[PDB]
Amino acid sequence: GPNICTTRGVSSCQQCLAVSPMCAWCSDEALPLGSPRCDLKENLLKDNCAPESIEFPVSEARVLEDRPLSDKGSGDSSQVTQVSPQRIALRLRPDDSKNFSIQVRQVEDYPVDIYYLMDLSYSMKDDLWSIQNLGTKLATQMRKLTSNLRIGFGAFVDKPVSPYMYISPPEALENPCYDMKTTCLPMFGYKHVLTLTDQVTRFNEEVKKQSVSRNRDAPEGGFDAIMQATVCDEKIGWRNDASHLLVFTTDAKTHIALDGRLAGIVQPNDGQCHVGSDNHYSASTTMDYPSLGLMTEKLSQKNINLIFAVTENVVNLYQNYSELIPGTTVGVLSMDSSNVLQLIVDAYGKIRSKVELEVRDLPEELSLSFNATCLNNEVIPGLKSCMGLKIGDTVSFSIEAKVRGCPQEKEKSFTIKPVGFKDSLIVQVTFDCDCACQAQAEPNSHRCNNGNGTFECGVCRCGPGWLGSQCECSEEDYRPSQQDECSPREGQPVCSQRGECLCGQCVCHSSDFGKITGKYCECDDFSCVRYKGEMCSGHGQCSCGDCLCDSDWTGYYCNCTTRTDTCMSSNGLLCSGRGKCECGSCVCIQPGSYGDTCEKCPTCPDACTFKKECVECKKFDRGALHDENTCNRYCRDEIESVKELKDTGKDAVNCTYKNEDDCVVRFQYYEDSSGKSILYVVEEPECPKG
Amino acid sequence: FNLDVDSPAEYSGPEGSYFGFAVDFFVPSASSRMFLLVGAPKANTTQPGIVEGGQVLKCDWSSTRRCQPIEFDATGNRDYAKDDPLEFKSHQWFGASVRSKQDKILACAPLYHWRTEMKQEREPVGTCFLQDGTKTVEYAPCRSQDIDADGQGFCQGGFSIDFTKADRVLLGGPGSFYWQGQLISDQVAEIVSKYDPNVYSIKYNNQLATRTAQAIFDDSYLGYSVAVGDFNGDGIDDFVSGVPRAARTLGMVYIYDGKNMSSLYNFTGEQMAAYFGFSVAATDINGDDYADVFIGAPLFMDRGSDGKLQEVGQVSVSLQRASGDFQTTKLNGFEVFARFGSAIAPLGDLDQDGFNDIAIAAPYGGEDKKGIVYIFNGRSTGLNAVPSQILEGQWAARSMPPSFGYSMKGATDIDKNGYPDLIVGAFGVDRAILYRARPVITVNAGLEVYPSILNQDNKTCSLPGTALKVSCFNVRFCLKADGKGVLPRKLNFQVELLLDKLKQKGAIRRALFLYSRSPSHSKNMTISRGGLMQCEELIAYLRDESEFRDKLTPITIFMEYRLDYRTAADTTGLQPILNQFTPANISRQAHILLDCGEDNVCKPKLEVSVDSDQKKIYIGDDNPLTLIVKAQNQGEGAYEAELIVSIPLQADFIGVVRNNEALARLSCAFKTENQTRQVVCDLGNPMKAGTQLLAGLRFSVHQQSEMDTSVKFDLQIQSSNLFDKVSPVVSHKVDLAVLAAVEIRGVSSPDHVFLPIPNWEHKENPETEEDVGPVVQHIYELRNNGPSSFSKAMLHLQWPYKYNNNTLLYILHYDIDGPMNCTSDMEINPLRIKIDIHTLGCGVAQCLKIVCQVGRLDRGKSAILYVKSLLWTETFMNKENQNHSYSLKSSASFNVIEFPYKNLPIEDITNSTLVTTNVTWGIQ
Amino acid sequence: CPQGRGDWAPTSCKQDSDCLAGCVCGPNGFCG
Ligand SMILES: *[C@@H]1O[C@H](CO)[C@@H](O[C@@H]2O[C@H](CO)[C@@H](O[C@@H]3O[C@H](CO[C@@H]4O[C@H](CO)[C@@H](O[C@H]5O[C@H](CO)[C@@H](O)[C@H](O)[C@@H]5O)[C@H](O)[C@@H]4O)[C@@H](O)[C@H](O[C@H]4O[C@H](CO)[C@@H](O)[C@H](O)[C@@H]4O)[C@@H]3O)[C@H](O)[C@H]2NC(C)=O)[C@H](O)[C@H]1NC(C)=O
Ligand SMILES: *[C@@H]1O[C@H](CO)[C@@H](O[C@@H]2O[C@H](CO)[C@@H](O[C@@H]3O[C@H](CO)[C@@H](O)[C@H](O[C@H]4O[C@H](CO)[C@@H](O)[C@H](O)[C@@H]4O)[C@@H]3O)[C@H](O)[C@H]2NC(C)=O)[C@H](O)[C@H]1NC(C)=O
Ligand SMILES: *[C@@H]1O[C@H](CO)[C@@H](O[C@@H]2O[C@H](CO)[C@@H](O[C@@H]3O[C@H](CO)[C@@H](O)[C@H](O[C@H]4O[C@H](CO)[C@@H](O)[C@H](O)[C@@H]4O)[C@@H]3O)[C@H](O)[C@H]2NC(C)=O)[C@H](O)[C@H]1NC(C)=O
Ligand SMILES: *[C@@H]1O[C@H](CO)[C@@H](O[C@@H]2O[C@H](CO)[C@@H](O[C@@H]3O[C@H](CO)[C@@H](O)[C@H](O)[C@@H]3O)[C@H](O)[C@H]2NC(C)=O)[C@H](O)[C@H]1NC(C)=O
Ligand SMILES: *[C@@H]1O[C@H](CO)[C@@H](O[C@@H]2O[C@H](CO)[C@@H](O)[C@H](O)[C@H]2NC(C)=O)[C@H](O)[C@H]1NC(C)=O
Ligand SMILES: *[C@@H]1O[C@H](CO)[C@@H](O[C@@H]2O[C@H](CO)[C@@H](O)[C@H](O)[C@H]2NC(C)=O)[C@H](O)[C@H]1NC(C)=O
Ligand SMILES: *[C@@H]1O[C@H](CO)[C@@H](O[C@@H]2O[C@H](CO)[C@@H](O)[C@H](O)[C@H]2NC(C)=O)[C@H](O)[C@H]1NC(C)=O
Ligand SMILES: *[C@@H]1O[C@H](CO)[C@@H](O[C@@H]2O[C@H](CO)[C@@H](O)[C@H](O)[C@H]2NC(C)=O)[C@H](O)[C@H]1NC(C)=O
Ligand SMILES: *[C@@H]1O[C@H](CO)[C@@H](O[C@@H]2O[C@H](CO)[C@@H](O)[C@H](O)[C@H]2NC(C)=O)[C@H](O)[C@H]1NC(C)=O
Ligand SMILES: *[C@@H]1O[C@H](CO)[C@@H](O)[C@H](O)[C@H]1NC(C)=O
Ligand SMILES: *[C@@H]1O[C@H](CO)[C@@H](O)[C@H](O)[C@H]1NC(C)=O
Ligand SMILES: *[C@@H]1O[C@H](CO)[C@@H](O)[C@H](O)[C@H]1NC(C)=O
Ligand SMILES: [Mn+2]
Ligand SMILES: [Mn+2]
Ligand SMILES: [Mn+2]
Ligand SMILES: [Mn+2]
Ligand SMILES: [Mn+2]
Ligand SMILES: [Mn+2]
Ligand SMILES: [Mn+2]
Ligand SMILES: [Mn+2]
């Protein structure tokens, strides 16, 4: 039986298990010579080592908790549960993998929390209409998506130091509007006003008192307020098992980290809570602004969603900022648009429109693969995110966990989690690296040797450099090494030169750069393969001529990533829906489509072609998207029958087509005016006459 | 890599004074000594009424680490009236900027506040102080009569400062003009010659200064950082400044001329909020006498292994060329939240290799947030991205982060040992540390062994103790050293020799030293600097012909040498260090005489041959090329046989083929030495007679010059034998080919028009589009997908203008996207219009032709023609057989006429496509 | 058409009386 187990595992039980997940070992002394010890279970079964003498662990993933997915967010009976299972126990062998799966559901009537950061600087004087009767305008539009709503709010101006603060005439310390001979309020860094409550009564009254303050420079640094409202959850009132929305409303641009050096502020933000009993940021004057990275980390740990409620003059700005804090939404604040009272509920749709998985505390040895089943059993490899969802949908992720080699340590515990939700799948990973052979041995001393022999897992291992099979494999004899063994077939040189067979066991360990092992000395430990001048592309360790890719890398050379971010396009769908993602680069598979994300396709048919498929499945219960059940996921554009179609000379794109009933359907779609793509259909298609 | 890390000179100052916030060297011209300048912008002073005025200390390097305040100003606040201070020095951060030319010491106080002479205010204009040993002046170019956020009231000048070669001061202040920022440059002589202690707002002649701009530039913070260097023809240093809030928070870096503050060049960040331009540094890193720009973005978020944003920080290396152009590369941090680009400090030539070096600092990185400083060595290619040394902070946090590395100054050899040194500050722990450069030593070792081919029958040497007359040979080993800078003239190494290094793993060592009887030997050699390759001798011998094991494995003789690191610079023992990239050991091989014939010598016949299996490769692509090599030895044994595959400029090596058993897994490696890169492959030591090796070598070729016509390899086996030790050279040629998979694609939008048309009424003389009909748009695309490019091609469009003297698709306008000029043989838009089935295909219709001239399309470039036409409705509502369906057919063809690659078998590419617009009747 | 720098806000629209030139008025009564 010349297999991989019989080759690299004949040393001991420890190194036999590490050869392949398919190897077995024979502990007992049943025929302890002339027979292989690391062969498979079945080849160790015929040659009978059948009893507990066989050391053969198997990898497994046991589920320790899986509560059923809840139907509603009202905690009537037990609690809310949006992920199943909850605790898997992973038991892993060296170089082995074991796949499992997880289901995620955005339940309905989920309790929502809304904290409101108000810019109270002077620029906002012309912008405080929004805060007026807010709790009514938060309740009157969120009730449709949830009961059990809580609201609170705070305010921020800027750091109360120079060069931001008006300190110069003493009467400007208490009235920054000393000039203009007006009256406004003293400035403050961040003021917590109202803890999250359920009474819009006390809210609307507490909001109407608010008036503006004044400082010098147009940046206002609410990022100090964002951080404190995130990590002071005890003071803010963030509830467990509730959507957390942090709404940020401001007039102009914002200070960023390192700006405070102009103020003599050179201490980085520590991300800790510093609001005390006075409800004031006690380190506003001593601590720099927070960096985007620190905000993102804390915004994700505390499962907070940041909403940017900003004005037209500055919308492009935070829109560009939001791309750096993934999962944040922007929204215009002006009555010159369709919906301003629906501003937050429009955003909460976007937040819940996707489910992306995140990993915490992943052991460095482990590497996770991800399939994604987002719609109707349509498995998508390499995706840990499903998009286009609505509140209520349910998605499934299939997960693989593989370890390279195996670490010797206690059991670790990492978390697989939906972004922005309390519910999590905790994976207790234990590594079955060693056999039950070391403890079961006699002491390592006084055994088969003249002085200090150490053995008794399976074989005699006596002395250094000699290690006799019985004992004392010695210097030049021409004894048992007769080229019978020490050569895979006796028509070949001895032990794969780079080594000569002295006794039965050839120590071929001629000191090449790196290391050398293998019974017949065939293993390399280097010279695996090179993509650039680096072996395994620098992303993989070399094991007997084979590249063991590091986490997030695959391929014979370990030069192909698992990333899909470079594959994503601006619209959100990967490769713009016209290509496959392979090695982090879109391979566009579609006629006449090209570009990094297949965004360019001037030969592709006009949108009049796919949008008509949504007209047929939503309005006529007909077409191809109806057969594949994809109409409710793909057709999210609101369609309306509009009674002899409207038209303005303001970029209305008109489309027509002829259905199965020989009737000419006519429709136009007003391209995104508020991001919304609305679709207008004429009733009474042109049908023939009798 | 040569900074001494175990004997650093540590200086400390007052607690909570931010001692170490800024550092520089003091090299007075009236003293052979040198000093450390360290600012403490929060140190307390004897100035009356001034809480935390700040100091600048000079520190004696001799010994005892004494730091004493320089007295720039001992006075309190000047007064505007009886009890109405004119200035406020309390909490002014004096010393946050410190620069020193020869004897001038410029220190600044960027938070220095001022009560204007107009209204009671506190405006942080910032001040400076220039000391010339005896005379001390005040430089406050932002204390003008232009006072407010509107003007210079908040300029905070001296936030960043620097000197030029001609004693010009460059000063930055990021608060001028509603925080647009400002650069102000003044000659040093004018600063002292114009100083007037009774005048608060002094005008300096020859002042260079930026001016306020449009309000769009507010809050950009120009002057956050400054550096100087020449980026023009003149010898005059030009002005580099960081403006990290500029450009919608992308950040930018402005380069101004040194003569007249003219704008020269601009760098723009790639990522918002990253603080591109937090720091700048100018130095010549590639030894081309052209200053290079280094921009730091310490909050840069790059993509981790999983594609997730992580704040690691990024330093931008921009190499100046003969033209204005800059070759710019990027260099990312290593630990998250470490703030990698915080401080960038030129080192001069830390190793004296001939190329200048630089140090970048991640002051919040390291273990326990102690700080890290990475040393990067320059080379001819530019900066080497892999750091050669890591300076790790020693001090732990007390109240705030140590910030070790927040400030750094190099480029000055304070020990006068020939190598520059390096100060590093940590204002969180109130310390500053000076690292001294070690002297680099380049040692070349030789090892030669008398006859490599040992005959056991030939025993012409006696043996001590027993006189058996055994076979012997000699081992000679040479050692020479040389090193720049100060260095002891004689060095003491510890050389060690090992016989048969492949053995000693428990096998039998087959050679022993004669007198010592052992395979190991040691000796203390002592050499002098220079050349003079001083050698030594020893006598080793072989065991008995019937004693050890075997005769094919060769005797590897191993020499290693280690330098005893005493013999140091006598100053706390500044011990030297060996050159970084040098082998600390060399080894040669001796063979046993065996199967060499009666001539007593092995004379091989070496042959090499190779076939193509592809015979042609295409230009634009990266082609897999596998050469099948046959290396056979039909003569006597070949000691240390290796296959030498000399690859050309274009291609490189991938790996050996192991997917097939008919070929061999030869160990191969990519070598570069001595002006020629090549591939070596071990054929066996020895390569026995009649040995026929066969394997394949995978490659990847990319054409170098667009007119090359071929790729030639050269194959040769060579061996360490004395006679007949090389094979004939075999040159294999692979021919470059041209392949341009070009295709033309078309589409109509829409592709159907339904009749009748809504709100359509026949106008007498049609004027707009609504009076004519709907918009039919034909889009034609010519895309080159194949590897090879082309230089010229033609494109012809056939268009159905008329049928029976009746317009069909009235072309309004045609646009082009790409390298293409089009011309229509009939005037487009004669009427000046503002903003079964029957096929009509220009073979039965009046054809309007459009001819386009396509330029160079590369591997993935397209050329597109957009034809916006109107449906002539007046036609289709007539005895033009209304209720009859028509298919308006247009076609387009192309012919590729020219390719940039000459001397090559180009063959033409023609193809065509057709686009239809089916106008038909949906109802009667 | 006009604007201001810093923590700026249009003063108050009693248009045709208060603001010298301005370029807009409307809700909540603010100038251009
Ligand atoms: C590196 O990047 C830097 C930053 O992007 C570049 O610096 C910028 O370069 C621009 C190009 O030179 C330059 O724009 C020019 O600005 C001057 C400023 O003079 C003005 O004078 C008037 C009163 O003082 C005011 O202009 C009127 O118009 C503005 C709107 O622009 C109104 O809002 C005002 O009320 C006012 O009525 C300004 O306040 C300003 O002080 C202009 O004169 C120039 O005019 C030129 O272009 C126009 C076309 O629109 C022509 O008609 C005219 O004859 C000139 O050719 C430019 O607008 C920026 O000021 C400058 N910014 C900074 C901070 O340096 C830099 O050039 C670049 N370098 C390189 C090498 O790439
Ligand atoms: C330079 O000299 C100035 C001289 O004034 C010196 O400034 C002083 O620093 C001390 C710090 O040691 C300040 O003392 C503080 O006073 C405030 C009230 O004014 C207290 O609140 C401070 O904290 C106390 O209370 C806290 C909670 O209630 C406790 O946690 C804490 O342990 C204290 O008991 C503290 O006592 C003093 O106000 C200033 N004076 C000024 C600024 O005028 C400065 O430190 C010196 N700097 C250097 C580098 O030597
Ligand atoms: C049998 O084995 C013995 C082994 O001892 C061998 O005798 C040795 O041969 C070597 C070389 O084969 C001889 O040493 C030489 O000495 C002369 C000076 O008299 C040198 O010219 C030789 O070449 C060197 O020349 C320069 C020195 O002047 C060097 O710069 C150069 O690099 C060369 O090294 C060489 O050193 C000598 O005959 C002995 N030496 C010893 C130590 O025994 C004998 O040749 C073998 N015979 C057969 C038939 O196998
Ligand atoms: C990792 O490295 C390997 C090897 O260097 C890369 O594979 C090489 O590139 C492509 C992979 O699909 C293969 O295709 C070859 O190029 C032309 C281009 O038109 C193609 O049409 C042919 O099929 C041709 O075979 C190429 O053969 C392959 N080479 C080898 C030796 O396998 C791989 O792309 C690298 N991956 C990354 C992400 O860099
Ligand atoms: C992830 O998706 C792939 C998509 O094919 C699943 O299929 C495996 O694909 C790779 C290589 O083709 C291998 O793991 C197996 O050959 C495939 N397994 C099959 C077909 O059962 C893969 O199983 C998925 N993994 C997880 C953990 O869901
Ligand atoms: C400031 O100095 C620079 C160089 O010393 C001048 O740049 C040249 O000016 C002349 C005349 O205006 C032009 O013909 C050249 O093309 C300029 N050289 C360039 C742009 O590289 C500049 O004119 C000087 N004066 C200013 C900027 O006002
Ligand atoms: C002996 O020489 C070898 C080879 O020159 C060196 O050991 C390693 O060599 C590889 C390949 O050049 C390097 O990548 C390693 O970094 C070297 N090891 C070390 C520790 O640096 C080295 O010069 C010598 N090694 C010994 C143990 O004597
Ligand atoms: C022109 O383009 C056509 C695509 O319409 C291609 O024709 C292919 O090549 C030959 C010629 O008919 C056939 O073997 C293939 O089956 C064709 N494919 C088709 C018709 O789909 C080809 O790229 C070009 N052909 C010529 C003759 O120029
Ligand atoms: C527009 O009309 C033409 C001519 O009738 C259509 O061309 C048809 O294409 C099919 C292949 O799909 C071929 O059998 C013939 O060339 C045409 N059909 C018949 C029955 O003659 C063309 O498909 C029409 N356009 C669209 C969008 O359907
Ligand atoms: C936002 O980003 C876009 C490109 O992503 C850019 O064109 C635009 O100018 C940016 N605007 C702001 C205000 O950052
Ligand atoms: C070599 O040097 C070491 C230490 O410097 C010393 O112990 C040894 O005796 C020396 N040997 C000779 C031969 O000089
Ligand atoms: C198109 O015309 C312009 C000027 O008429 C010329 O510079 C350009 O080279 C032309 N391009 C081609 C592809 O003929
Ligand atoms: Mn406003
Ligand atoms: Mn402000
Ligand atoms: Mn210059
Ligand atoms: Mn240079
Ligand atoms: Mn150097
Ligand atoms: Mn030095
Ligand atoms: Mn011979
Ligand atoms: Mn404001």
UniProtKB/Swiss-Prot annotation, chain A:
Domain description: The VWFA domain (or beta I domain) contains three cation-binding sites: the ligand-associated metal ion-binding site (LIMBS or SyMBS), the metal ion-dependent adhesion site (MIDAS), and the adjacent MIDAS site (ADMIDAS). This domain is also part of the ligand-binding site.
One GO MF term attached to the UniProt entry: virus receptor activity
Domain (VWFA): residue spans on this chain: 109-351
Disulfide partners: C5-C23, C13-C435, C16-C38, C26-C49, C177-C184, C232-C273, C374-C386, C406-C433, C437-C457, C448-C460, C462-C471, C473-C503, C486-C501, C495-C506, C508-C521, C523-C544, C528-C542, C536-C547, C549-C558, C560-C583, C567-C581, C575-C586, C588-C598, C601-C604, C608-C655, C614-C635, C617-C631, C663-C687
Biological function: Integrin alpha-V/beta-3 (ITGAV:ITGB3) is a receptor for cytotactin, fibronectin, laminin, matrix metalloproteinase-2, osteopontin, osteomodulin, prothrombin, thrombospondin, vitronectin and von Willebrand factor. Integrin alpha-IIb/beta-3 (ITGA2B:ITGB3) is a receptor for fibronectin, fibrinogen, plasminogen, prothrombin, thrombospondin and vitronectin. Integrins alpha-IIb/beta-3 and alpha-V/beta-3 recognize the sequence R-G-D in a wide array of ligands. Integrin alpha-IIb/beta-3 recognizes the sequence H-H-L-G-G-G-A-K-Q-A-G-D-V in fibrinogen gamma chain. (Microbial infection) Integrin ITGAV:ITGB3 acts as a receptor for Herpes virus 8/HHV-8.
Assembly: Heterodimer of an alpha and a beta subunit. Beta-3 (ITGB3) associates with either alpha-IIb (ITGA2B) or alpha-V (ITGAV). Isoform Beta-3C interacts with FLNB. Interacts with COMP. Interacts with PDIA6 following platelet stimulation. Interacts with SYK; upon activation by ITGB3 promotes platelet adhesion. Interacts with MYO10. Interacts with DAB2. Interacts with FERMT2. Interacts with EMP2; regulates the levels of the heterodimer ITGA5:ITGB3 integrin expression on the plasma membrane. Integrin ITGAV:ITGB3 interacts with FBLN5 (via N-terminus). ITGAV:ITGB3 interacts with CCN3. (Microbial infection) Integrin ITGAV:ITGB3 interacts with herpes virus 8/HHV-8 glycoprotein B.
Tissue: Isoform beta-3A and isoform beta-3C are widely expressed. Isoform beta-3A is specifically expressed in osteoblast cells; isoform beta-3C is specifically expressed in prostate and testis.
Boundaries of every I-EGF domain copy: 437-472, 473-522, 523-559, 560-599
Protein name: Integrin beta-3
Residues that bind Ca(2+) 2: D158, N215, D217, P219, E220, D251
Any GO BP: wound healing
Main location (coarse class): membrane
Effect of S162L: In GT2; type II
Chain residues that bind Ca(2+) 1: S123, D126, D127, D251, M335
Membrane topology: Single-pass type I membrane protein
Gene name, Swiss-Prot/TrEMBL: ITGB3
Record note on what altering I304N does: In GT2; not expressed on the surface and absent inside the transfected cells
Effect of M295L: In GT2; uncertain significance
Curated annotation (Swiss-Prot), chain B:
GO molecular function, one term: extracellular matrix protein binding
Pfam family, one: Integrin_A_Ig_2
FG-GAP repeats: 2-68, 79-140, 143-195, 207-261, 262-327, 328-385, 389-452
Annotated protein name in UniProt: Integrin alpha-V
Gene name of the encoded protein: ITGAV
GO cellular component term of the entry, any: integrin complex
Binding partners and assembly: Heterodimer of an alpha and a beta subunit. The alpha subunit is composed of a heavy and a light chain linked by a disulfide bond. Alpha-V (ITGAV) associates with either beta-1 (ITGB1), beta-3 (ITGB3), beta-5 (ITGB5), beta-6 (ITGB6) or beta-8 (ITGB8). Interacts with CIB1. Interacts with RAB25. Integrins ITGAV:ITGB3 and ITGAV:ITGB5 interact with FBLN5 (via N-terminus). ITGAV:ITGB3 and ITGAV:ITGB5 interact with CCN3. ITGAV:ITGB3 interacts with ADGRA2. ITGAV:ITGB3 interacts with FGF2; it is likely that FGF2 can simultaneously bind ITGAV:ITGB3 and FGF receptors. ITGAV:ITGB3 interacts with IL1B.
Entry keyword annotation includes Transmembrane: yes
More info: The constitutive activation of ITGAV:ITGB3 on neoplastic cells may contribute to tumor growth and metastatic potential.
Subcellular location(s) per record: Cell membrane; Cell junction, Focal adhesion
Topology, Extracellular side: 1-924
InterPro entries: FG-GAP, Int_alpha_beta-p, Integrin_alpha, Integrin_alpha_C_CS, Integrin_alpha_Ig-like_1, Integrin_alpha_Ig-like_2, Integrin_alpha_Ig-like_3, Integrin_alpha_N
